[PDB]
Structures are given as structure tokens and as C-alpha cells.
């Protein structure tokens, strides 16, 4: 079984990590140093608990397997949005949930943010409003 193979691998990976004294964050950083693709402590945690989708585990397994084999021998950084800035965006959302591209650019300029971050903030916020009904 593919699912059972992922279960057994996650277990073997976790055991070897712990046997060597690595934290989850350590091994995520190690994978960036050695193979150029760092992952967060959060992701390592989810992988070891099988709290990722099937496709997602199948994607990461060969990367984690490179480190395990040694042990047995690209995305942009997540932008932090200040509380007062988030509240400014939220109050705008309440009366204009879908600003135009021009307005998005103006908001970014006024708030000293990147236009793409503001664009994506509104996209995600619309999706949230759907999720929470």
C-alpha cells in the first residue's frame, strides 16, 4: 500500500532524526543546506504525523529520503503584517471587499507594502469570508 509505505517511512524518518538528536527545525534547515530546499519545523511536524495530504507526502518523501539515506550511510518568505496594518486592511475589506487593481496599488503605496502582498491579502480574505460563511 502507498499509504502504508508513507506511514512506515515517516516512522523510520522520525526515529532516525531522534536517534541522532536532531530537532524537527534542525532537519528542515539541513535539507536547505544539503539539497537547497529548506522546510519549516511545522512542515516536518506535519509530515511525521501524516497530517499532510497524500500528494503532499508523496512530494516531500523523496526529499526527506535523501537526508535519511545520508543519516543511514524557492517560495517567497511569509510576509508578517503588523497588527495596525492588518486592521486597516480589514476595515477597508468590510466596505470594499474587492478593490480595483488601481486601489490595490494605492493601498500598497500608502501602507508601504508590496502590491502583490496587498492583492493576495484581499484574495485570501474573500476566500475566508466564504469559508466562515
Amino acid at each position: 500500500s502507498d499509504l502504508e509505505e508513507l506511514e512506515k517511512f515517516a516512522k523510520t524518518f522520525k526515529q532516525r532524526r531522534i536517534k541522532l538528536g536532531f530537532t524537527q527545525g534542525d532537519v528542515g534547515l539541513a535539507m536547505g543546506k544539503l539539497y537547497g530546499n529548506d522546510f519549516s519545523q511545522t512542515t516536518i511536524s506535519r509530515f511525521e504525523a501524516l497530517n499532510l495530504s497524500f500528494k503532499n507526502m508523496c512530494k516531500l518523501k523523496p526529499l526527506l529520503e535523501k537526508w535519511l539515506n545520508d543519516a543511514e550511510s524557492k517560495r517567497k518568505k511569509r510576509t508578517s503584517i503588523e497588527t495596525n496594518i492588518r486592521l486597516t486592511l480589514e476595515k477597508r475589506f468590510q466596505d470594499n471587499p474587492k478593490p480595483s487593481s488601481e486601489e490595490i496599488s494605492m493601498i500598497a503605496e500608502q501602507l508601504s507594502m508590496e502590491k502583490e502582498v496587498v492583492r493576495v491579502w484581499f484574495c485570501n480574505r474573500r476566500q475566508k469570508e466564504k469559508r466562515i460563511n
Binding site: S53, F54, K128
Partner: peptide, 22 residues
């Protein structure tokens, strides 16, 4: 009370439990 953020759908953990149940 409502979950605010995005959740993974169909984790391997859940799929394994679903398979082992039937």
C-alpha cells in the same frame, strides 16, 4: 467557534483510518 483558516483535506492519517475501517 468556527475554524478561521485553511485546513488540509484528506490527510494521510485520515485516509489510513478510513481504509482500515472499510
Amino acid at each position: 467557534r468556527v475554524y478561521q483558516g485553511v485546513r488540509v483535506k484528506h490527510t494521510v492519517k485520515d485516509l489510513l483510518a478510513e481504509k482500515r475501517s472499510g
